[PDB]
Amino acid sequence: KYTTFQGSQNFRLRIVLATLSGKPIKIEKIRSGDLNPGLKDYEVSFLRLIESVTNGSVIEISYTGTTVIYRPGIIVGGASTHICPSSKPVGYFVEPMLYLAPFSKKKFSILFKGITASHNDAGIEAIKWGLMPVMEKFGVRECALHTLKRGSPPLGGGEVHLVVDSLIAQPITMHEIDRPIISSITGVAYSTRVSPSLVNRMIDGAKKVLKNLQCEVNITADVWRGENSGKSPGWGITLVAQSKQKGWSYFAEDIGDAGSIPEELGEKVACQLLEEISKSAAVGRNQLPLAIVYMVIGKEDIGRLRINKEQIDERFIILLRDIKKIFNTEVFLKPVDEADNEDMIATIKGIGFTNTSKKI
Amino acid sequence: PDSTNIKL
Amino acid sequence: GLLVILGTRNGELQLFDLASSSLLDTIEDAHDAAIWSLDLTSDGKRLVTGSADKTVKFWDFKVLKLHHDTTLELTDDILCVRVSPDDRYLAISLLDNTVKVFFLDSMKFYLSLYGHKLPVLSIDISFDSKMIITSSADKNIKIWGLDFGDCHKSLFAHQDSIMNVKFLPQSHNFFSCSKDAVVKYWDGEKFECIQKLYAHQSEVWALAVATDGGFVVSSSHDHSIRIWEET
Amino acid sequence: PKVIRFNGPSDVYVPPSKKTQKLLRSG
Amino acid sequence: WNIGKLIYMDNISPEECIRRWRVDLEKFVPYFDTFEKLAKKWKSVDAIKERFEYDTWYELQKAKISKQLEINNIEY
Amino acid sequence: KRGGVIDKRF
Numbered sequence: 001k002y003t004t005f006q007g008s009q010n011f012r013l014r015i016v017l018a019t020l021s022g023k024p025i026k027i028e029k030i031r032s033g034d035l036n037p038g039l040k041d042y043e044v045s046f047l048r049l050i051e052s053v054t055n056g057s058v059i060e061i062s063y064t065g066t067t068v069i070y071r072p073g074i075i076v077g078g079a080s081t082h083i084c085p086s087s088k089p090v091g092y093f094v095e096p097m098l099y100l101a102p103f104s105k106k107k108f109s110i111l112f113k114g115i116t117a118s119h120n121d122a123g124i125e126a127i128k129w130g131l132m133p134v135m136e137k138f139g140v141r142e143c144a145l146h147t148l149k150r151g152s153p154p155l156g157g158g159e160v161h162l163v164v165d166s167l168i169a170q171p172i173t174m175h176e177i178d179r180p181i182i183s184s185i186t187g188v189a190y191s192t193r194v195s196p197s198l199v200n201r202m203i204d205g206a207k208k209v210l211k212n213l214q215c216e217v218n219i220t221a222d223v224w225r226g227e228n229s230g231k232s233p234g235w236g237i238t239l240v241a242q243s244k245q246k247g248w249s250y251f252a253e254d255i256g257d258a259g260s261i262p263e264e265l266g267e268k269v270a271c272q273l274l275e276e277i278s279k280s281a282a283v284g285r286n287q288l289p290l291a292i293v294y295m296v297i298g299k300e301d302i303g304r305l306r307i308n309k310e311q312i313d314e315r316f317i318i319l320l321r322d323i324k325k326i327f328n329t330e331v332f333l334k335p336v337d338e339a340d341n342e343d344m345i346a347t348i349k350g351i352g353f354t355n356t357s358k359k360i
Numbered sequence: 361p362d363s364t365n366i367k368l
Numbered sequence: 369g370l371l372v373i374l375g376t377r378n379g380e381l382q383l384f385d386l387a388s389s390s391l392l393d394t395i396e397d398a399h400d401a402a403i404w405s406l407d408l409t410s411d412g413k414r415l416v417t418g419s420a421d422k423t424v425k426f427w428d429f430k431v432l433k434l435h436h437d438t439t440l441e442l443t444d445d446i447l448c449v450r451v452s453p454d455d456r457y458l459a460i461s462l463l464d465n466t467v468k469v470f471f472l473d474s475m476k477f478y479l480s481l482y483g484h485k486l487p488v489l490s491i492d493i494s495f496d497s498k499m500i501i502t503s504s505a506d507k508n509i510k511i512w513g514l515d516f517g518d519c520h521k522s523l524f525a526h527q528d529s530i531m532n533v534k535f536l537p538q539s540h541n542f543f544s545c546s547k548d549a550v551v552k553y554w555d556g557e558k559f560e561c562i563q564k565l566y567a568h569q570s571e572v573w574a575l576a577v578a579t580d581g582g583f584v585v586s587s588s589h590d591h592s593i594r595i596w597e598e599t
Numbered sequence: 600p601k602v603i604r605f606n607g608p609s610d611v612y613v614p615p616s617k618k619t620q621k622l623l624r625s626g
Numbered sequence: 627w628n629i630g631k632l633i634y635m636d637n638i639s640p641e642e643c644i645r646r647w648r649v650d651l652e653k654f655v656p657y658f659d660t661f662e663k664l665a666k667k668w669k670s671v672d673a674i675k676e677r678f679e680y681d682t683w684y685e686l687q688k689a690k691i692s693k694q695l696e697i698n699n700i701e702y
Numbered sequence: 703k704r705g706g707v708i709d710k711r712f
Binding site: 438 | 600601603604606607608
């Protein structure tokens, strides 16, 4: 019948993984005990987005809204526009699409509208340089997120266009058992509807922390000014640690609220990126969910990915248990032979997924 | 200009 | 209402008592140059003074005498210093046509307002510490959002230099005075001139608003002090 | 008395050219 | 306490699994410690300085396939 | 078009 889950925990994946598998799923007891039970608008909006890029899928939400039945269709894609409710930014909706877009009948050219940043979801600049670079490593050669308008909270007004040109049968098998050597650190300091002095001060705060390092530091000042600057003033920084040896990235990102010091947050994110590096072996934590699934959906082949002990956390474990429930795939783990670090190798057999929706 | 003049 | 503090052009700080009818204390070396601006915290225990020596000096009231606390030296001469009603912000005007905002508790730099072509003469902060107004000699009033330092609107209020602008208490409305001998009543939300007052024969050097906001007092170069009462 | 020197960030702004602006946006 | 067993023992909660051998991804940004605690930790950066021919194309592809199959046998 | 988000929510 239907594999059953509980709660809103990992709502997007259980649908995304369901969509890729073709296996029907039931999500039940969604916030049953809360005063406002059931699905939230942004989650409902995500369901509308899933229907738009697919055909033949049946989505049934209970009368109380606490249970949803999802029978997946085929990924079809196409050109469309999606209005994102204010409760979540665009990155909330762009992220799941990255998981499905490269395996589509037609090209994904989806136009997103709403707030473009938040304290808890992926930013524009994170996706462009923090998640997407992983996709090229997995064989998604061409994928772009064009920034037509930035929208800061609370009024938003931003505009981002998601285009993936690479359509592939399945991602290449993953083989990385080493600790990447970071060559340089880059980033974009952006602000909307404000004075460019704020942008410079943040790079100053970021540079203050990171000047101790022996590698080059170059942070772009992307001040957005004019009609494309959104309807609210806002600002943020994302700093990316880059490895040109085999094309890898580690990144951190935060945005600022009213009354905060641009130098303070610039110091925070620059300090923040180092913690992500410290917890990273081959990938930072915030792209573990993206990389692991691609290994799972590879050919009938064992991929290898080096992970740190700091990365194997509750989020990692719940993610794995979700994968097994739906694919029956188990991520085996063997220790590294080195003693300098306690890094860890994740080995995954692919389920032999293929893009059967594309035309030959 | 002179600071004294412009304001006073 | 029993004491008055005065800042002179010679850099001296003077304190008077009404009951004694005499000067209690004088600080000859309060500043090396004219003490252009002087502001007090809401508690009334800390005094802020701006001078032509390019410094801001903080003073404490201890039983009554003044003691210098800290010196904040700026790159340029200071025209006006204002303390927010909540005592969280400190705004200072410089001859370089930029207004600098500081955090009163920690003296950390917060914002650098820019866009005035001539130096800012007066600064005033809303009762809620959200909106801040800057009036400069360039005949323009600029209303800024203190959350991000954003100029909501720039108003060509008067035909000459605008010396003083004050918020009405418990409201975003404000008044403005200029060398054109006209006092104008404005709406802080709609940004429109509510009323124009033509009584002054010459330049209007100072303006003050009652704590209740019932009346406003303006004095000019004609030696005339007049009281504008809300009817 | 404590003396604190505040050399604030310069407010002078060098605007990027429109063409380099497009190149950076495209990435 | 081998974690590998702990992962697949669904009866043990992940939080319980974590602690023995020592919240939600919808928040893309992962959990971090407080800034001031974070700042003191890297007044020094020393901890992380450590991170910082086949004749024909056909034989190459056969080599890639053959090498991969060998990897499966070793790990199996 | 086929499929749909058949919203039976109150």
